[PDB]
Amino acid sequence: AYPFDRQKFSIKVDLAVPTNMFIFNEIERFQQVVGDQLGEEEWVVTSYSQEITEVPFERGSTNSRFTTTLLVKRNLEYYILRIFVPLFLIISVSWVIFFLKDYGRQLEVASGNLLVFVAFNFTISGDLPRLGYLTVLDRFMIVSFCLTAIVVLISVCQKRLGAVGKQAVAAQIDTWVLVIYPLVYSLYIIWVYLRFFTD
Amino acid sequence: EPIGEAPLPRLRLTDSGGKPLAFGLISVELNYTCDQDICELVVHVDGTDDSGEAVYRLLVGINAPNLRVGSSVFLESDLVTVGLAVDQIVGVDQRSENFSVVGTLKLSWHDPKLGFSPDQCGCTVKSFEDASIRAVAGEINLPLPSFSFYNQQGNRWSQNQVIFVTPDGRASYFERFTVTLQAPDFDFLAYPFDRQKFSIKVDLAVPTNMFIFNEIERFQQVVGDQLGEEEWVVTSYSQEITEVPFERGSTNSRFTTTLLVKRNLEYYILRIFVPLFLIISVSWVIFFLKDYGRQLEVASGNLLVFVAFNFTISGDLPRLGYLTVLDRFMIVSFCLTAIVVLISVCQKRLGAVGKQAVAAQIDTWVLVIYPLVYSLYIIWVYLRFFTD
Numbered sequence: 001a002y003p004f005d006r007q008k009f010s011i012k013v014d015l016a017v018p019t020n021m022f023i024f025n026e027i028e029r030f031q032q033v034v035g036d037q038l039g040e041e042e043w044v045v046t047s048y049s050q051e052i053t054e055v056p057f058e059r060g061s062t063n064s065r066f067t068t069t070l071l072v073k074r075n076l077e078y079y080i081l082r083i084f085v086p087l088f089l090i091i092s093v094s095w096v097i098f099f100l101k102d103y104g105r106q107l108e109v110a111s112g113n114l115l116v117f118v119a120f121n122f123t124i125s126g127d128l129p130r131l132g133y134l135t136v137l138d139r140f141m142i143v144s145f146c147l148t149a150i151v152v153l154i155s156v157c158q159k160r161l162g163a164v165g166k167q168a169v170a171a172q173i174d175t176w177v178l179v180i181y182p183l184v185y186s187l188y189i190i191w192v193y194l195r196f197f198t199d
Numbered sequence: 200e201p202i203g204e205a206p207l208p209r210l211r212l213t214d215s216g217g218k219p220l221a222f223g224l225i226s227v228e229l230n231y232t233c234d235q236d237i238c239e240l241v242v243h244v245d246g247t248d249d250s251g252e253a254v255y256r257l258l259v260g261i262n263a264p265n266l267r268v269g270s271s272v273f274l275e276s277d278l279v280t281v282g283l284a285v286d287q288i289v290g291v292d293q294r295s296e297n298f299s300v301v302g303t304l305k306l307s308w309h310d311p312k313l314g315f316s317p318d319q320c321g322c323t324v325k326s327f328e329d330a331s332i333r334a335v336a337g338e339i340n341l342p343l344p345s346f347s348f349y350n351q352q353g354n355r356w357s358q359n360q361v362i363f364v365t366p367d368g369r370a371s372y373f374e375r376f377t378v379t380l381q382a383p384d385f386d387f388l389a390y391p392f393d394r395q396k397f398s399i400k401v402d403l404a405v406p407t408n409m410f411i412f413n414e415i416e417r418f419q420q421v422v423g424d425q426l427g428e429e430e431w432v433v434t435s436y437s438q439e440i441t442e443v444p445f446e447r448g449s450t451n452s453r454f455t456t457t458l459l460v461k462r463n464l465e466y467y468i469l470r471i472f473v474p475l476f477l478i479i480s481v482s483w484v485i486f487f488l489k490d491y492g493r494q495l496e497v498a499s500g501n502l503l504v505f506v507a508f509n510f511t512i513s514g515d516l517p518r519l520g521y522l523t524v525l526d527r528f529m530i531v532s533f534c535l536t537a538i539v540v541l542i543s544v545c546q547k548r549l550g551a552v553g554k555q556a557v558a559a560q561i562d563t564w565v566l567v568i569y570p571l572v573y574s575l576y577i578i579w580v581y582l583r584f585f586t587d
């Protein structure tokens with residue numbers, strides 16, 4: 001669910017003697033469990049816990065274990081402002097070109113905006129982890145590229161229609177696209193939320 | 200005595216140091232009586248002096264002049280039970296061809312020479328912690344089943360090493376390791392549709408007449424399950440015991456664990472192939488336009504998008520010294536996209552001169568041939584690299 005994922009950091013300390021010799025009994029708090037440091041941090045801690053349990057031993061019987069768990073999350077303001085806000089403006093440029101009644105200039109603006117989308121992918125290349133599987137952020141960028149590339153295909157069809165002599169048909173396509181295009185993005189976002197977040 | 204096709208075999212009886220003690224007499228038979236305080240015998244069977252198989256039955260006995268169950272007279276090698284479990288795959292190096300693994304290894308064997316008496320300790324189990332089998336054997340001056348990882352590179356991080364012995368004589372070993380193993384059998388010629396094999400070999404360091412692997416125990420799941428997704432998924436696995444030649448001579452035992460793995464196909468299909476199809480299809484659809492001052496500029500502009508798209512997937516392309524399946528496809532696509540620019544220039548010159556019917560016929564031919572070349576090339580790639 002990158003970048004909206006929450007992880008757990010577990011620090012386990014195990015005794016190396018059987019539980020009939022030494023056993024963990026009490027937990028003392030001689031200092032703050034999570035210290036405070038100046039400045040901001042990449043991972044922020046929301047809660048923590050400490051517990052004592054028993055685990056099987058290689059000798060036999062059991063031994064004691066002391067566990068400290070920290071619940072962490074990322075910095076959401078970083079990803080929203082740096083990635084999602086610039087992405088929205090690039091996408092909205094391809095939506096607004098359908099108001100033009102000429103297609104020799106709509107086609108060249110649509111083709112030019114596809115290059116800006118690809119170039120924008122280089123800046124945020126560092127912010128995209130190089131794992132072997134798709135994440136939530138990776139899926140959204142693939143859908144946006146396909147919709148931007150389809151706009152170029154529709155523009156070519158409209159120009160051919162106008163040159164032949166049928167312009168009313170081309171004008172009706174503009175009305176349908178201006179309505180359907182914002183609808184597909186809204187529907188896809190809801191689908192992503194249902195699949196990965198609300199079970 | 201042989202069973203069939205008798206070659207008159209030669210047999211010898213020497214001391215432990217090789218000094219002969221008795222010689223065969225022609226059904227070869229021989230007898231010998233020793234009177235020293237310590238008397239150890241070695242039985243030699245020679246067949247050096249083309250034959251079909253062996254077909255032999257050897258009979259020996261002590262104080263048994265008759266011959267022709269009782270108790271065992273020949274020494275028997277110890278039997279060792281071994282198990283291995285894999286917990287994680289840390290990483291894979293595709294240039295030096297090695298991978299890192301995390302797991303657990305367990306050994307166990309029975310040896311009466313290791314027994315003791317509880318009276319002298321008031322305890323049931325003995326302990327040797329944070330020491331390898333080789334180090335412990337030197338301390339107690341007893342032979343032990345030393346082992347090693349065959350293809351290990353560098354040192355390995357060993358944790359929870361321990362040996363415990365019981366008064367009866369049963370001992371066992373336990374260790375958690377993090378090791379890097381060399382795998383020169385990697386073949387990345389069908390990237391990203393390639394399937395590899397990960398082999399973990401454990402070799403005994405003693406001759407097969409002393410210790411031999413006998414049984415495999417499954418104390419845990421061989422391949423563990425972890426939360427989340429993984430780059431390499433495991434489809435099947437196997438475990439086997441074989442014998443390999445030794446530097447001393449004779450043979451030694453080997454325990455092998457093989458994991459069959461494959462990549463994540465949904466990652467490469469959606470991220471690379473789907474965007475590539477849309478870029479290619481843009482160059483195909485521009486041939487419907489009847490003007491060439493705008494077809495030429497769209498065709499030229501789309502070539503720049505193809506090159507810029509190659510920067511994003513630069514990380515997904517390995518930097519090996521040879522061409523893979525993915526590399527070959529990208530080269531063909533670039534050449535076809537660049538040829539479209541060349542054809543567009545020719546058409547514009549034809550229209551300016553005054554011949555437009557000829558230029559219109561070229562559009563019809565290209566719109567048909569262009570999708571055909573891509574389909575033909577894909578079939579050719581499939582025949583060459585996948586279906587033999």
Ligand SMILES: [Ca+2]
Nearest residue numbers: 037038039040
């Ligand atoms: Ca700081």
Ligand SMILES: [Ca+2]
Nearest residue numbers: 425426427428
């Ligand atoms: Ca995981």
